[PDB]
Amino acid sequence: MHHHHHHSQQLQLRVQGKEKHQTLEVSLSRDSPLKTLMSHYEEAMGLSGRKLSFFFDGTKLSGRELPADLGMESGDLIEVWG
């Protein structure tokens, strides 16, 4: 989450799905919209085309948000349902 090698302007985020093995720590630029993380997760997990829904703070992500739009911070978690 906070290892010393990380660039100080990226956010480390945990993306966690329904199974223990459906998980990924994603490094996201502050100026990348969340859709980049959501696609990244789908691509890494092999779950493209499954209509997964990503939640932060109890609300569904559209993918259009920057992390700052939501008060999302390095070390936060995004829950993937489906």
Swiss-Prot record:
Signal peptide: none
Subcellular location: Nucleus; Cytoplasm
PTM info: Methylation at the N-terminus by PRMT1 modulates interaction with the NFAT complex and results in augmented cytokine production.
Modification Phosphoserine, positions: 32, 53
Domain Ubiquitin-like: 11-82
Domain of life: Eukaryota
Role, per record: In T-helper 2 (Th2) cells, regulates the magnitude of NFAT-driven transcription of a specific subset of cytokine genes, including IL3, IL4, IL5 and IL13, but not IL2. Recruits PRMT1 to the IL4 promoter; this leads to enhancement of histone H4 'Arg-3'-methylation and facilitates subsequent histone acetylation at the IL4 locus, thus promotes robust cytokine expression. Down-regulates formation of poly-SUMO chains by UBE2I/UBC9.
Assembly with partners or alone: Interacts with NFATC2, TRAF1, TRAF2 and PRMT1. Interacts with UBE2I/UBC9.
Protein name according to UniProt: NFATC2-interacting protein
Annotated organism of origin: Homo sapiens (Human)
Lineage summary: Eukaryota, Metazoa, Chordata, Craniata, Vertebrata
